[model samples]
Target: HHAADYVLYKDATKPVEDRVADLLGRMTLAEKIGQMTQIERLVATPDVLRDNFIGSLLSGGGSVPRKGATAKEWQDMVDGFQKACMSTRLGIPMIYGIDAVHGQNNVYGATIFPHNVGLGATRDPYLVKRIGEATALEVRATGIQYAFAPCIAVCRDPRWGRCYESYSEDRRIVQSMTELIPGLQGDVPKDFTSGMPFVAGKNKVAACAKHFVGDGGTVDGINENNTIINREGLMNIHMPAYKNAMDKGVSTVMISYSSWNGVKMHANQDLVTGYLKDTLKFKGFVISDFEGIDRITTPAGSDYSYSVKASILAGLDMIMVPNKYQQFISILTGHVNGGVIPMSRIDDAVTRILRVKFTMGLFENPYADPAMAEQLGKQEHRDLAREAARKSLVLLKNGKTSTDAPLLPLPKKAPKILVAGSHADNLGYQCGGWTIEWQGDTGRTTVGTTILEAVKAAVDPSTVVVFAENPDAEFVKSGGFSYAIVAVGEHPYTETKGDNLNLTIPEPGLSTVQAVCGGVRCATVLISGRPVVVQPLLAASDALVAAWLPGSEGQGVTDALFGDFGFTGRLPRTWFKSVDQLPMNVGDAHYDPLFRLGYGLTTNAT
Candidate 1:
């Protein structure tokens, strides 16, 4: 019945009014309410799903279906749930969602693309779109039909815990690039299978342009805080991307956890229910952030009944109930039945949800192919990830004279090389956050090569490589070692735990760098999510490489290090001389970055 069917539905298009009337006629109040619920996959099961009639399930960062589920297994699990949801009297298929923010990251083998910050440096929306299409396929391979993607948060300061998730500080970039939306939806009409297309099947998914209204401008870049921007500032800056995504036919818009002025986004009636729904004309339903409604009131504890009442009344179409489903269902059902919440609000929510489900073609086919699991972490995806990794490496200092005449392209026959630093042999550190576990871990978290292993594999078999997890100056003084390669960076930290004001490399890492440099002439590769203050140690290093969280492809770094490839990645975020210039970026009135956003060096050998 939604107009989207004219564009999406395989069969003849149905009029919006006719579709809405038909869908409305067949649903009970309970069925309508079930469409408004979203539960975390970790807390869901077949029995729980059937009993509650939940509408959706999602994998937050690090949250997967099983302990060691492969991509295909994840898909099967989701398919089973969808099948169960369909067996109900109304047979409404549940939407499976995940925060595939940077590729299908939660899965073990799914290619982890460069985070948005790295993509921002490339300034290539087309590439971003292509990545989105690939991401949709990987997500679809696992039977998911909704992705919480393209954060669209115009992060003003890098101090924010989730800054890497944002594309840029500039609203223009985010606004102009709604390519991600169409990428996930796939090519319309001309060739559904061509371009960076979505997978063809029953469970084809929809993408959500999220955190409606000023999430990136929080005071001091704090997570879930007040954003003190006037209406004009809001419209001109943060609002443009949402407008563009909607125009591109984005099916969903997620509410932010932060408040504008003083009112929380969940409780602000005028903004959530009025401006977004009425003026902007966003056709899809608005869902809340994880437990976003409960955080609105003072105590910060559970007041499930009151929170549910306020959130629904405030125009939240779907609640990311997460863990507490029974409480949410009971409170919401009671409110609607007792007339505390109007039937009109319930109808509005259900109508928007059904329209999306119908538009996405989930009703027709609710199963995922178990065979596609083999395609989860295929070689092609790894090659794509390698390309992304190579593009994300920014060269900070190219040394005085290319000491080796092409600093890269290390002679394949070099007798012996010294690899030092705690991170040199760790795959977990290289992959960073959102790996096998939520925050990522130390040691072999998943199946991947460490930079040390990559280096060993890259060079000739005759080449002798000595690895020191924490080599001291005495060990470095042993001599006979070629150039020392030191890998140093921040440990894996996600969400608010990653926020830092100083932005300095950890002390032990600094000492290791100092020790390794003192022992031999070295090419220091700095692995970090953002550029930290490295000015103090500039004199101690010869060449500097900025490896911004290179996921699983350690070979990409080795390829650049060993001269098999050239250094091509440019700085995605500005490298600050000091944290004093907290948020300095390109195009600033007095821009003076240690390394500009597009800064990178090309080796002569290439």
Candidate 2:
């Protein structure tokens, strides 16, 4: 049939609408429903995709083809799935997605840029956009066409586990960071309409502006809890980033698991469909978070039928069913057959999915590029990440005394220097969560220099550099060291696992600061996801720097410390004096923080 004449949907010269229409008309009920369901890679076999007409596949946190899988390995895995989708009756291609939130982080050799909280400190939109461009290349190198990135949440409270995923507490900052959308999806053409999805070429992939509205406003920063704000507060603080994303032609949006005033977001048709789709005119499809619909009910999957009906009607075009595709497909089909779910809703969902696929050029060129795999872990990208890290190090304290000289720009020619802390030599600790594993891990988790190594490399060749995980005061005093560098803070964690009411720095980290700073002059660097209890740490240290999960680029830390680069990063979140002052932000009426938002001491490069 193709030898005679190319089908309308396959013709690249035709308008996208005509192509979507041609394809939609050709698909049966099974095929259309399949286009709306997304499955995990473990169950996404060729037979399943062809028989069920599945539309998408994803690698969840730590999910890969194999341990330490190269970009080529990832490419081949996704290509195999795409090939299987091609074998279907209509030959509709499927999109593959991964959580490449910070520099294609899941891939072993990929450059890991600082997380959003760190990027937020820089307050540079252009840098964020450039990171997105680099991330797009690395993502495409792996043959994946979609990245669940640029988490545009306006985190109002530091207690939120995913606060580091957010750019800042201010919606304006988050809106500015939406420049990442254009970088990820490629800039919209001059003639392009607002809210329409666009991908310039194969180098770019579809970008998802995630967790929709109010994900960062959960009470006490609890994960997936109720955001008890009125519509006024919600629109002012949490909804602006999405508008900016749509303006930049973001390809998709993911719904949050959290609720708005007792209503689960998966069932909030007023916001998902009415506000996002109708009022704002978002042309891209809305996706569910991983197992998002299942959690709509208390027991989770308690009422599958209701979950299906509510989510579909709420304008969730793609269901991230992940593992249980058969059950989801069967139940959704039953609803349609019984007229409980309208055929129009199904068509709307399929059309949005197909629009993104077509815009992504999936049908025209659906396989992995053998040569593009070389783009992974390129030095230039690492250099970019290094620069980002350099700018993200907020100088919270320059000296213990107002009259004393600054402790930073430490002498490279010193006779001896002590580097002490649990985090000093740990690459995984610096990279933090959403790294190689979901919650992240320690000990050479991936290829990268640690702060200890960077310090060693930066000092004069004749100087002695010593590393101690948690050195005691006696050891520190006996070493006859010139000065100490103590790197310590939070461990790796993702989502709810990272939530903390106390907001205090964990043990060994706190102990290291006490020991090193107590004995000698020290510059204590806090490697954390969000603001932690810092009063004691600050009082002890001669100098302090907030290094917010500077991923895989330890040299960046040294660059700022040694004055190769100046300290320019501002505080992205308000540092509280006590945990009792729970939800204090920059704009609060009675705000009294240890450090205010936009606070960073400038240091001149030597």
Identify the runs in model 1 with alpha carbons over 4 angstroms from their true place.
Answer: 1-20, 175-178, 188-204, 338-340, 400-406, 585-592
lDDT of 2 by residue, 1-606 (tens): 255877889889888999999999988999999999999997778899999999999999998888899888999899999999998888998999999999898889889999999999999999999999999999999999999987999898889999999999988889989999888888898887778888886889999998888999999999999999999999999998888888899999999999999999999999999999998898888999999999999999999889999999888999999899999999999999999999999999999999999988988889989899999988999999999999899999999889999998888988999999988999999999999898989879888889999999898999999998988889998999999999999999999999889888789887788889888899999999999988888889999999999999899999999999789999888888888898988899999998899999989898
lDDT of 1 by residue, 428-456 (tens): 88877767677767767766677898888
C-alpha RMSD values across all candidates: 4.2, 1.2
Would you list the clashing residue pairs of candidate 2?
none
TM per model?
A: 0.90, 0.99
Weakest ten-residue segment in model 1 by summed lDDT: 191-200
Q: Please give the lDDT score for candidate 2.
A: 0.92
